[PDB]
Design a protein around this ligand. Structure first.
Ligand code: ZN
Ligand code: ZN
Lengths: 428, 430
C-alpha cells in the first residue's frame, strides 16, 4: 500500500487500441533506456530514464534489466486448464478422458499449480480459461491464481449431453454450480467469471436456457464458448438446432453475444455471422496452433479487421501444443502467409498484448505501461537458441528484434514474470 | 581397435519399406539394450543380458538408462551460410538471402560460422546433412574442414550461380566448373565427406552453367546433385520464361542430365503429374521443407502422392528460410502441413523420415540410419523428459507410438543429451 519499485531496461508497448493494422506503428512505443515505477500493483510512472530517475529515492534499489526487452504480460484469450497432459472425434478419444481425471480434487490442485507455473514461465499474466465440468476443479484453479493475485477469467464447463456420462452435468446442476462459483470468485480480487458452455452440441436447449439466465442475473460476467472451428461441428450444430439460423444464431438467440462474449476459433463463419459478431461487439479467440494441428483451416484475420471485430490470441492448450504466446504468434504468421496475408511484428505484438486485452475488455486494466495500469510484465531476452541470439545480434530495427522474438522465441526467452507488481517467476 | 559399450533404451527401423503402414513391422524397441562400437561402426547390438559378456573389464559402460537412444537425424536440405538471416515476390532472395550469403566472402567469418553451423547440427542431433554451401569455394573448404575434424558424414557443394543475382555473388560458367572440380578432388570421398553438384536453381544458371553442371556429373558419376525445384508458382513461371523450349521446370534439370540416383530436389510443392512420374522413373529424391514452405506461404508438400509415386522423401530444415536446426520441430511442421491435406502423419512415419527414410533419400541407408551390424556409429542420446511439460506428456502416454510421437514431434534441442559421430562423443548438453 506504500513502497515504490523501480525497473530499468528497454520497454515496448502500444499506447492505445486502434482500428486498422496500418495505425499500429503510430501507437507503438520503444524506450531503449526506460524507467517503470510501481506502487500498489500499478504503474505509478513510465517513460525515459532521464525524465523519471529523479523520482527514485535512495531508500529504493533499481532492478536493472538493461540488455533485456520488457513487455506487458501476454494475454491468452482461449486455453483449457484441464488438458496440460493431453497428446494427439478428437473429443471422445482425447479431450473427455483427459478431463475426467480433474474430478479428483487433489489432481485438480496439483495441476492448477502446474498450469499457473506454465503460464508464468511463458510470460502469460492473463488468460481466459476453460475449466472442467467439475466445480471443485474451477475452485482449485481460482485458488492457485488467487495466491499471486493474478487477473484471470475462468468458468465451469456446462455440458449436459452428447458426451460420456462421467463428464455430463444437467441444465439445473450447471445453473447452481456456476452461480455458486460466480458468488465465490467473480470480482474476488482480480479474478473474473465466464459462463462457459463447452459449445452448442453438448448443451441441451434447457442448458442453453440456464446459460442465458446466468448472463441476465450476472450482466458483468464473461461468456466463453467455441464457434465454427470445423465444418462437421457446424453441420452437427445445424442438425441439433435446425430452427436457428446457423451456429452463432444459437448463442445469439440465447442472449450469449455482446461485450465480453468470446468465441474461440471462428474459422468457418458465414458473412451474416461476421456482421452479427461486429454488431454485438463480440470477441474472437484466434487459435492458429490448434487450427493447424487439427487441420481446421485458416482464420481470416483480414476480414476481422474489415468487419471491426475484436480478436485476441489463444493457445487452445490441449489441442494446441504450446503455452508460449511468441510461438502462437509464429503460427499466426504461418496461417496468415498461406492466405497471402503478411503479419507484421507490430500487429503480432499488438495481438499478444493490448489487442488481446481489448478482446477480453481488460484494456483499461492491463496491456501497456500507462499510469494506473496493473503492473503485469515480462522480462524477455533472445537466448532460447544460439540461432535466436545470432539473429537478434544481426537485427537493428525494432520490427527486426520483435520478428526474432516471434519466430525463434520459446519459454527460454522469458527471464522474469511480474504479476500485480511482484516477481512471481524467474528462469533457472 | 578398442571397444566402446553403450547401455539404455534403443529405437530404430531395421529395413527400408514401401508403405507407411509397413514401418510398424520394421520398428525395433529394446528397453534394456547394449550397443558395442568398434572402429566407428556397430560391432554388436541387442539385449543387455544377450551381449554384456562381450564387455571386457578394461572399459566403462556409458550408462544412459532413463534416456532413449536413436540413430542420428538426417537433414536433406540446409544452407550453411544463412544462419543469421532475418526477414509477395521471390525478391526475398534479393532483400534477405543474397545480402546474408555475401558476408561468407570473408574466409575468417566463413570459418567462425562453419564452427557455429556444425555445433548447431550436433546440438540438435543431426549427424548427416545435405548442405548448400556458398558461391565462394574457400567458404565450402571452411565447411568441409569443420565437418572433417569430427569425421562427419556430410554432403556439401559450391553453389553455381552465373546470372539473375547481385554481382557480388555471381560466378561464371567456367569458374563454376573449375571451382567445383577442385573441391570434388579435395573433398569427395575424403573420409566420410561427399560432394554434391549444387546449381542454386534454373533461374540463376545460364545454359552454359547448366552445361558445366552436366559435365561435372558425367566426369564424377558418384557425386550427388542438389538443387531447388517448384517451391512457388512465381519461381516456376520465371523458369518457364527463361527456359521456354523445355517441357517445364524439372525438364530443364532432366535434359541437362541432373536427374537420377543421388539427385535431391528441395521443396517440390508445385509438381505437375508429368514431373511426379519423371522423379519416380529417374529414382530422384525430394527434400520436404515444411517450415520454409509455411513461412514463405509456398504451400503444402503432397507426401501422400510421393508414397503413391514411390519417390524417396527426406526432411529438410531449409535453414535460412526455416527458423530451426531441430528435426523434431521440423517433423512437428510436417504434421501441421499434412493435417491441412487431411493426411495423418504417424509417429512411425515421422521417426522413419528423420532416420533410415532420410538416409534412403540420400542413398546412405547401407551406411547409417539404424543399429544393424556394420553401420556407422552416428547416434543421439535423447531425454524426451527434458522439460516439465515433456515429462508430464511422456508419463501420460501409455503406448510406444504415443511416447515416440511426444519425443519425435513435440521436443526441441533440450531433448538432445549426447550426440555421437563416427562412434565418438562430439556433443554434450551443458
Ligand atoms: Zn478450446
Ligand atoms: Zn534451399
Amino acid at each position: 500500500e506504500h513502497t515504490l519499485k523501480a525497473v530499468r531496461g528497454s520497454f515496448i508497448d502500444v499506447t492505445r487500441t486502434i482500428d486498422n493494422p496500418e495505425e499500429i506503428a503510430s501507437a507503438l512505443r520503444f524506450i531503449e533506456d526506460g524507467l517503470l515505477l510501481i506502487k500498489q500493483g500499478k504503474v505509478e510512472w513510465f517513460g525515459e530514464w532521464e525524465n523519471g530517475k529523479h523520482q527514485i529515492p535512495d531508500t529504493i534499489r533499481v532492478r536493472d534489466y538493461r540488455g533485456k526487452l520488457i513487455v506487458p504480460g501476454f494475454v491468452d484469450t482461449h486455453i483449457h486448464y484441464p488438458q496440460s497432459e493431453m497428446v494427439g472425434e478428437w473429443l471422445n478419444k482425447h479431450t473427455f478422458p483427459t478431463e475426467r481425471r480433474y474430478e479428483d480434487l487433489e489432481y485438480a490442485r496439483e495441476m492448477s499449480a502446474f498450469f499457473i507455473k506454465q503460464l508464468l514461465r511463458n510470460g502469460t499474466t492473463t488468460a481466459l480459461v476453460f475449466g472442467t465440468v467439475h466445480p471443485q476443479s474451477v475452485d482449485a484453479l481460482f485458488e492457485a491464481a488467487s495466491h499471486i493475485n493474478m487477473r484471470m477469467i475462468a468458468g465451469k464447463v456446462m455440458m449436459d449431453r452428447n458426451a460420456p456420462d462421467y463428464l455430463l452435468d444437467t441444465a439445473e446442476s450447471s445453473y447452481h454450480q456456476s452461480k455458486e462459483l460466480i458468488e465465490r470468485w467473480h470480482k474476488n480480487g482480480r479474478l473474473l467469471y465466464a459462463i462457459t458452455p463447452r459449445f452448442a452440441p453438448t448443451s441441451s436447449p434447457e442448458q442453453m436456457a440456464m446459460a442465458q439466465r446466468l448472463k441476465e442475473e450476472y450482466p458483468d460476467t464473461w461468456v466463453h464458448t467455441h464457434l465454427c472451428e470445423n465444418k462437421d461441428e457446424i453441420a452437427w450444430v445445424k442438425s441439433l438446432y435446425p430452427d436457428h439460423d446457423g451456429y452463432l444464431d444459437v448463442y445469439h438467440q440465447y442472449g450469449l453475444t455482446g461485450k465480453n462474449c468470446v468465441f474461440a476459433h471462428c474459422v468457418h463463419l458465414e458473412e451474416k455471422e461476421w456482421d452479427r459478431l461486429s454488431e454485438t461487439k463480440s470477441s474472437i479467440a484466434f487459435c492458429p496452433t490448434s487450427n493447424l494441428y487439427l487441420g481446421s483451416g485458416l482464420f481470416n484475420l483480414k476480414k476481422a479487421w474489415q468487419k471491426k471485430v475484436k480478436v485476441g490470441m489463444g493457445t487452445d492448450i490441449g489441442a494446441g501444443t504450446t503455452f508460449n504466446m511468441l510461438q502462437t504468434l509464429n503460427e499466426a504468421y504461418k496461417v496468415l502467409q498461406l492466405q497471402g496475408y503478411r503479419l507484421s511484428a507490430y500487429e503480432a505484438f499488438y495481438l499478444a498484448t493490448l489487442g488481446g486485452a481489448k478482446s477480453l475488455g481488460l484494456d483499461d486494466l492491463i496491456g501497456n505501461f500507462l499510469p494506473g495500469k496493473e503492473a503485469d510484465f515480462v522480462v524477455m531476452e533472445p537466448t532460447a537458441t544460439p540461432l535466436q541470439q545470432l539473429r537478434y545480434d544481426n537485427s537493428v530495427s525494432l520490427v527486426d528484434k520483435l520478428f526474432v522474438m516471434m519466430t525463434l522465441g520459446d519459454d527460454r526467452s522469458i527471464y522474469r514474470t511480474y504479476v500485480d507488481g511482484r516477481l512471481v517467476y524467474e528462469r533457472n
